[PDB]
Amino acid sequence: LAGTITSGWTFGAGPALQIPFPMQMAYRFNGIGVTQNVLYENQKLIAN
Amino acid sequence: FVSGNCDVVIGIVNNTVYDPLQPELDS
Ligand SMILES: *[C@@H]1O[C@H](CO)[C@@H](O[C@@H]2O[C@H](CO)[C@@H](O)[C@H](O)[C@H]2NC(C)=O)[C@H](O)[C@H]1NC(C)=O
Ligand SMILES: *[C@@H]1O[C@H](CO)[C@@H](O)[C@H](O)[C@H]1NC(C)=O
Incomplete structure (x- = not known):
């Protein structure tokens, strides 16, 4: 849990590199075909 | 992108x- 929260998927393929959690969520949103601005503009709703 | x-x-x-275009335009 700590690894997947503080470093995303990097810790599973080498050294663990830190990254802020909203930026990781933006990365994962890009993973499924949605742009970052959607998450950055609906962060509060998504967290709720 | 904006x-x-x-x-x-x-x-x-x-x-x-x-902006790359502006210096070219002014030159
Ligand atoms: C980042 O965004 C802009 C960049 O200029 C700033 O917005 C204005 O900045 C001036 C000078 O710093 C202030 O007097 C104004 O009150 C700001 N707001 C508006 C609506 O004009 C902003 O301050 C910059 N810095 C931040 C957001 O920390
Ligand atoms: C990041 O953390 C610092 C101190 O922990 C805090 O002051 C700052 O507001 C945080 N960043 C944002 C975007 O809130």
Whole structure:
């Protein structure tokens, strides 16, 4: 849990590199075909 | 790429975005 929260998927393929959690969520949103601005503009709703 | 304005995002930062076209136009 700590690894997947503080470093995303990097810790599973080498050294663990830190990254802020909203930026990781933006990365994962890009993973499924949605742009970052959607998450950055609906962060509060998504967290709720 | 541009989207929206500078109040919705949390953690936005002042900086400058260079435009390649302007110096060519002025030259
Ligand atoms: C980042 O965004 C802009 C960049 O100029 C700033 O917005 C104005 O900045 C001036 C000078 O700093 C202030 O007097 C104004 O009150 C700001 N707001 C508006 C609506 O004009 C902003 O202050 C910059 N810095 C941040 C957001 O920390
Ligand atoms: C990041 O953390 C510092 C101190 O922990 C805090 O002052 C700052 O507001 C945080 N960043 C944002 C975007 O809130």
